[PDB]
DNA sequence: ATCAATATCCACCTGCAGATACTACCAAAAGTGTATTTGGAAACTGCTCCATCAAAAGGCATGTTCAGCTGGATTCCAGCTGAACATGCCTTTTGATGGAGCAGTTTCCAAATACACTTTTGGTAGTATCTGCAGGTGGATATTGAT
DNA sequence: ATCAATATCCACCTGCAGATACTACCAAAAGTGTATTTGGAAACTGCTCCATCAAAAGGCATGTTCAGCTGGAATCCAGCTGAACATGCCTTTTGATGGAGCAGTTTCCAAATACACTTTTGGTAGTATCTGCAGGTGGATATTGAT
């Protein structure tokens, strides 16, 4: 039988129900959102891999991800995204 | 210091602006599906014969084409206004495409 | 240069009613000056800050800065170690005190608040989706 | 008794799946422990940002369901997102209403 | 066969595409130019799509081939898979 | 005395500066400006010589290209003088603004 | 602390850069514009160069940092290493 | 300095000597050619890796390289480059 | 290409100016290296037709 | 049509910085052989999605007319840019010193990988089902154009 | 300013296509626990290149003047585009049919990997050497601009 197609539909729906607790979403809009997530993921991962290559390291760490975020996102997006990532990493390692 | 702390006729150009608003409000596709499909098939046929297309493939091509042409027309309109005109002419298309880097 | 002054005090970096400087875009609270100024009895005329007053005093000439600082260090022979220090204090606009960061980071449960306030892990957190609460379900 | 990693970090996006995609994607020979956590955090942040803007655009249009037109309006009306997605075409998103000043009648 | 078909991009369709771009007055000779530039763009994209397709040893052109051929020219396209 | 009509020396200069490959900005002022700009992202920075040379090369290439586009937009409007609106149009079409 | 330093890009230098671009007559107000655009370009490149440098935990900005910061903006540069 | 900096100087000089027998080359021009070779190499390699990821393959083969050459180079260049590559491979395997 | 451009200039050695003149004078090579800056390469000599005298 | 005045290039010498070899030499990196796993190639097969036909009906494209308004050409005029001097200043160099910073070596130690289980979670079909929204209609409203 | 004629928007209503939803269910995969290996962090060191001065030399930048040519405004006029109407034609929708091509399943075997050893080789350094070229000097002359 035909295989399964993993996607980001359920997590996007969770985030939406958090920000706007009573608005739905279409299906073409959810397709746009999956494509957006994949594109941004690929961009950040490619930049982090380039960084790790330049410095003769063989490991991608949170430092590479943070520098890639600083390189890729413009302006205040970078500040807020760095805040979020740092907070999440700190909470994860505190447990 | 500061301390500041007899049949009705519309005048030429009216229906143009009405259409501009109408088509900048909408989101549909502005070309007919069948002629565009035939055009795509002719081109791909002179590239590699005996081809087949999913429907979503031709739909993607149509969306990309229309987005491209709308952007080109915006740039053309700026280049027309720059020379103190209202009418767009082919030289404006050529200038916009040359500055974008698509031709030279 | 028809600029406008900042919307925050240059000293404490907070908001309020400011006495402003005309030359530079700095603005200060009234108690955040040296010495603090009475909001009622404010001297009208041209108010300049400490830095711009230092500049206009030296006429924006630093050869004269050489001159006056050499003479100053020659005079303060009693405390020669604190000579240059005692000369720089007169070129700075006032500040408020904030601990150096090599002191705050000895204790990891201590975090600087929003306006430079103390927080010690007993602060719950500000409520973010309680901006979402004013909207509510 | 087995918690997830995204629940241990306090996220909605999956940390295990992002970790796997980083591993099998040919990006580096090794992948740290906090790289997927950081990446999931920033992905969730950007998602929430654009979704909030699009939901506002949907509300002021008297609707109760987000469509690609609302995503296009939200993206093109913000400066940072328009910088981030400047070379992206959204399928069936339309354009921004804009008529040049010299064209309007006077 | 499938010859001609470039005049199938009629003049009203180009006028609509211009109205969506904000144009108020249109010349008489821009229809030829628009047909030329559309043909050029289409050839440049279809060549790459067919290259991908035939590398995969297929006979059907998938939508992913099109979005790849577009992405490789700085014309990323959201909403069709990927 | 012997004078040249306006524009003659301009064409001479165009040919002369298109025949050459040397740099056109002075090195010391550009170096000072680069250091002052970088003074805002991090204090106490050091630069290699080749870093500043690369920056000068890239900047000059960028400005020459921009001036070509600007001259195009000026000839479009039946003019010979380039004006700031020409620069603004060339940068808007390019996508920089 | 360096100040102004932007008027060091004199008017004759900009006239030379224009002559190499083929310009025959120059206005009076383009010098301000050129200084503005040069400053913008330089900030955009130097920010990325410094980012690379400080990720490598160095204090000296290498030429490779500059060519990387340039390559990441579609301004590839040959002849300086790489 | 113990570290060695491998480059393409000697190979570019061999190519030059067979193409133009009595023409030298400057050092700056040699650096230009070095950057050119590295740039084109990483372009082709990145495209090959991408179109091997698309097809759920693990090996980079002659086919991936040929398709990357066809995708990256313009018409006549791509035709001649494909000719050269196939000639080299068939001479290699029959050796 | 660059060696031909150099010999046409009556020189014996290739300099970056010759590489630039060779790249920018070809069509497909110029399309392959359109977004590339070559150090000390200069530009291609051309003046617009309306700027010329008379 | 003539001619002085520049500015450019053609011809020749020369001192020198850069290109060209050679030995050393030396890691050090590539080629040779071999045992092993595994990923990609063949063959089969089901089924899904594409191409072809068909018809019919209405919405869109086409051709024509008429007139208004826009684009282009001509004149003029003022003011703004360029060309040529005459000072003066600030860039270039090149020589030397100080010294911070970066690259190489050794430990070691913390962290990421590999493997086996086991429960959870996210996805697909089937089927379901509400419900938001698109289509149709009328009524009010704002705007346009000629008096 | 008036008024009449159109196009757009708002309010109401209705059917239905799409979004929320289990349930099975279920299969894939993520989290947990050990043992191992290896890559990255820390201290030390030396030597390299970057900053900071100094001191002329002269080549470029700055300010002034003058005039001429170009950009901008005003007029006029033809011609070309738009707006509207009638006509037909061809796109879109619904529906069925054949059937080719794609995706999954099993087998299996040709090839890429991992290790260990030996041999070129190509890269840095002197180390030396030499010559192609950048700079300087004279003279021919091609072009410009005023007569
Ligand atoms: Zn204050
Ligand atoms: Zn002040």
Relative to the alpha carbon of C95, which ligand is closest? 1
Q: Please name the member of F77, F78, F94 whose beta carbon is closest to the beta carbon of B99.
A: F94
Under DSSP, is residue B79 helix (H, G, I), strand (E, B) or coil? Answer: helix
> In 3D, which of B89, C125, F27, D47 has the Cα closest to residue E34?
B89
| D48 has a chain A CB within 8 A of its CB | yes
The chains in contact with chain I, meaning 3 or more Cβ pairs closer than 8 Å, are F, G, H
| G44 has a chain A CB within 8 A of its CB | no
**8 A C-beta contact, residue B104 and residue F72:** no
Q: Which residue on chain F is closest to I40 by alpha carbon? A: F21
Tokens 């020396």, residue?
F9
* Inter-chain residue contact E26 with B88, CB threshold 8 Å: yes
| G16 has a chain I CB within 8 A of its CB | no
Residue G78 exposure: Cα atoms within 13 Å on the Cβ side: 28
CA distances, I49 to each of B41, F70, F72, I53, I54 (Å)? 42, 16, 12, 9, 11
Cα dihedral I33, I38, I41, I45, rounded to 10, equals 30
Residue D97 exposure: Cα atoms within 13 Å on the Cβ side: 10
Chain I window 18-47: which residues touch G at a Cβ cutoff of 8 Å? 35-40, 43, 46-47
Residue C112 makes CB contacts below 8 A (sequence gap 6+) with: C104, C118, C119
Chains G vs H: touching, with 3+ CB pairs under 8 Å? Answer: yes
Using a CB cutoff of 8 Å and minimum separation of 24, what contacts does C30-39 make? C32/C94, C32/C96, C33/C94, C34/C94
* Boundaries of every domain in chain A: 1-95
DSSP letter for C58, please.
T
- Strand pairing partners for B88? E26
DSSP letter for D30, please.
E
Domain A1-95 CATH superfamily: Histone, subunit A (1.10.20.10)
| D98 has a chain E CB within 8 A of its CB | yes
**Helix locations, C50-89, DSSP H:** 50-57, 62-75, 83-88
For chain E, how many helices (H) and strands (E)?
3, 3
**8 A C-beta contact, residue A32 and residue D54:** no
d(CA D74, CA D68): 10
- Strand pairing partners for B87? E25
**8 A C-beta contact, residue C31 and residue C113:** no
**Residue C91 backbone dihedrals phi, psi, to 5 degrees:** -110, 0
Tokens 């082919």, residue?
B90
Q: Residue A91: enclosing H or E segment and its boundaries?
A: helix A76-94
d(CA E30, CA B90): 5
* Inter-chain residue contact F89 with B95, CB threshold 8 Å: no
**8 A C-beta contact, residue B44 and residue E51:** no
Q: Please name the member of F11, F24, F39 whose beta carbon is closest to the beta carbon of G17.
A: F24
d(CA E22, CA B75): 10
DSSP string, C84-136: HHHHHGGGS--------HHHHTTSTT-EE-TTS-EE-S------GGGHHHHH-
**Residue F42 backbone dihedrals phi, psi, to 5 degrees:** -165, 135
Resolution in A: 3.9
Using a CB cutoff of 8 Å and minimum separation of 24, what contacts does F5-14 make? F7/G24, F7/G25, F7/I53, F8/I53, F10/G19, F10/G24, F10/G25, F11/G24, F11/I47, F11/I51, F11/I52, F11/I53, F13/G15, F13/G16, F13/G19, F14/G19, F14/G20, F14/G22, F14/G23, F14/G24, F14/I47
Under DSSP, is residue A68 helix (H, G, I), strand (E, B) or coil? Answer: helix
**Residue A24 backbone dihedrals phi, psi, to 5 degrees:** -85, -160
d(CA G66, CA G54): 13
- Strand pairing partners for F82? G26
Q: Cis link prior to G20 (omega < 30° from 0)? A: no
Q: Nearest 5 degrees, angle CA A57-CA A63-CA A69? A: 115
Under DSSP, is residue C34 helix (H, G, I), strand (E, B) or coil? Answer: coil
- What's the CATH code, domain D1-104? 1.10.20.10
> In 3D, which of G46, A54, I16, G82 has the Cα closest to residue F51?
G46
DSSP letter for A2, please.
P
Which residues in F7-94 belong to E strands, given as ranges? 46-47, 81-82
DSSP string, G10-50: -HHHHHHHHHHHT-SEE-SSHHHHHHHHHHHHHHHHHHHHH
> Parallel, antiparallel, or unpaired for β E25-26 and B87-88?
parallel
* F96: its two tokens: 């920089």
Domains and CATH numbers, chain F: 14-97 (1.10.20.10)
Q: Please provide the size of chain F in residues.
A: 97
* A25: its two tokens: 């979403």
* Inter-chain residue contact D91 with B63, CB threshold 8 Å: yes
Which residue of A92, A93, A94, A95 to mutate against D (max D Cβ within 10 Å)?
A92
Residue C101 makes CB contacts below 8 A (sequence gap 6+) with: none
Burial degree of I2 (CB within 10 A; 0-12, 13-18, 19+) = buried
State the distance between the two ends of chain G, measured CA to CA, in whole angstroms.
Answer: 33
Q: How many CB atoms lie within 10 A of CB C28?
A: 24
d(CA A8, CA A15): 11
Residue H95 makes CB contacts below 8 A (sequence gap 6+) with: none
* Inter-chain residue contact I38 with G79, CB threshold 8 Å: yes
Cα dihedral I5, I10, I12, I18, rounded to 10, equals -30
Q: Which positions on strand K lie below 7 Å from a protein C-beta? A: 5-8, 18-20, 28-32, 39-40, 49-51, 60-62, 68-72, 80-85, 90-92, 100-105, 112, 122-125, 132-134, 144-146
- What's the CATH code, domain G1-82? 1.10.20.10
Q: How many CB atoms lie within 10 A of CB E19?
A: 23
Of A residues 60-79, those with CB within 7 angstroms of nucleic strand J are 61
Of H residues 68-87, those with CB within 7 angstroms of nucleic strand J are none
Q: How far is the CA of C52 from the C1' of K56 (A)?
A: 38
> In 3D, which of E34, F21, G54 has the Cα closest to residue B94?
E34
DSSP letter for D19, please.
H
CA D24 to chain centre: 24
Q: Residue F31: enclosing H or E segment and its boundaries?
A: helix F27-38
DSSP string, chain I: -HHHHHHTTT-SEE-HHHHHHHHHTSHHHHHHTTTEEETT--------SSSS--
DSSP letter for F43, please.
S
Q: How far is the CA of D89 from the C1' of K61 (A)?
A: 50
Method used for this model? Answer: cryo-EM
Nucleotide nearest to F74 (CA to C1'): K71
d(CA D41, CA D13): 8
Nucleotide nearest to H10 (CA to C1'): K122
| E64 has a chain H CB within 8 A of its CB | yes
d(CA D45, CA D11): 10
**8 A C-beta contact, residue H22 and residue H10:** no
Residues of G in contact with I48 (CB under 8 A): 22
Which residues in C1-58 belong to E strands, given as ranges? 19-20, 27-28
**Residue C133 backbone dihedrals phi, psi, to 5 degrees:** -60, -40
d(CA D90, CA B64): 9
Q: Please name the member of E3, E26, E59 whose beta carbon is closest to the beta carbon of B87.
A: E26
Tokens 């739905």, residue?
A24
Q: How many CB atoms lie within 10 A of CB E26?
A: 19
Nucleotide nearest to H17 (CA to C1'): J20
CA I46 to chain centre: 11
d(CA H33, CA I1): 13
Kindly state the greatest CA–CA separation across chain I: 40
Q: Residue D90: enclosing H or E segment and its boundaries?
A: strand D88-90
**Residue D65 backbone dihedrals phi, psi, to 5 degrees:** -170, 130
Residue D8 makes CB contacts below 8 A (sequence gap 6+) with: A91, A92, A95
Under DSSP, is residue A46 helix (H, G, I), strand (E, B) or coil? Answer: helix
Tokens 């050269």, residue?
H84
């Amino acid at each position: 039988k035909r295989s399964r197609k993993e996607s980001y539909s359920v997590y996007v729906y969770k985030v939406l129900k958090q920000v706007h607790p009573d608005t739905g979403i279409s299906s073409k809009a959810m397709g746009i959102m999956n494509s957006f997530v994949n594109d941004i993921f690929e961009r950040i991962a490619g930049e982090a891999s380039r960084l790790a290559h330049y410095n003769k390291r063989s490991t991608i760490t949170s430092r590479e991800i943070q520098t890639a975020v600083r390189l890729l996102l413009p302006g205040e997006l970078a500040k807020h995204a760095v805040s979020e990532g740092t907070k999440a990493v700190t909470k994860y390692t505190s447990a | 210091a500061r301390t500041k702390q007899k049949p009705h006729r519309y005048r030429p150009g009216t229906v143009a602006l009405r259409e501009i608003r109408r088509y900048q409000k909408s989101t549909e596709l502005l070309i007919r599906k069948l002629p565009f499909q035939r055009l795509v098939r002719e081109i791909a046929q002179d590239f590699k014969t005996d081809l087949r297309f999913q429907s979503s493939a031709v739909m993607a091509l149509q969306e990309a084409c229309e987005a491209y042409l709308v952007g080109l027309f915006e740039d053309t309109n700026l280049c027309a206004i720059h020379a103190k005109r209202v009418t767009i002419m082919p030289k404006d298309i050529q200038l916009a495409r040359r500055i974008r880097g698509e031709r030279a | 240069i028809d600029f406008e002054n900042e919307d925050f005090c240059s000293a404490c970096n907070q908001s309020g009613s400011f006495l402003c400087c005309d030359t530079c875009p700095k603005s200060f609270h009234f108690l955040c000056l040296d010495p603090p100024i009475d909001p009622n009895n404010l001297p009208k005329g041209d108010w300049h800050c400490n830095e711009c007053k230092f500049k206009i005093f030296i006429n924006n000439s630093m050869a004269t800065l050489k001159k006056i600082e050499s003479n100053f260090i020659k005079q303060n022979n009693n405390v020669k170690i604190f000579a240059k220090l005692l000369f720089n204090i007169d070129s700075h606009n006032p500040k408020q005190f904030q601990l150096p960061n090599y002191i705050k980071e000895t204790f990891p449960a201590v975090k600087t608040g929003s306006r430079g306030q103390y927080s010690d892990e007993n602060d719950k957190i500000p409520l973010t989706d309680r901006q979402l609460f004013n909207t509510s379900y | 008794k087995a918690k997830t990693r995204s629940s241990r970090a306090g996220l909605q996006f999956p940390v295990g799946r992002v970790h796997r995609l980083l591993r099998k994607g040919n990006y580096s020979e090794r992948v740290g422990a906090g790289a997927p956590v950081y990446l999931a955090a920033v992905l969730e942040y950007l998602t929430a940002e654009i979704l909030e803007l699009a939901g506002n655009a949907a509300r002021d249009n008297k609707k109760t369901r987000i469509i690609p037109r609302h995503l296009q309006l939200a993206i093109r009306n913000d400066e940072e997102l328009n910088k981030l997605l400047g070379r992206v075409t959204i399928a069936q998103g339309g354009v921004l209403p804009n008529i040049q000043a010299v064209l309007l009648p006077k | 066969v499938l010859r001609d078909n470039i005049q199938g991009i009629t003049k009203p369709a180009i006028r609509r595409l211009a109205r969506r771009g904000g144009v108020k007055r249109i010349s008489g000779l821009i229809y030829e130019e628009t047909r030329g530039v559309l043909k050029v763009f289409l050839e440049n994209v279809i060549r790459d799509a067919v290259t991908y397709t035939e590398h995969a040893k297929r006979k059907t052109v998938t939508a992913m081939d099109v979005v790849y051929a577009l992405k490789r020219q700085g014309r990323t396209l959201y909403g069709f898979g990927g």
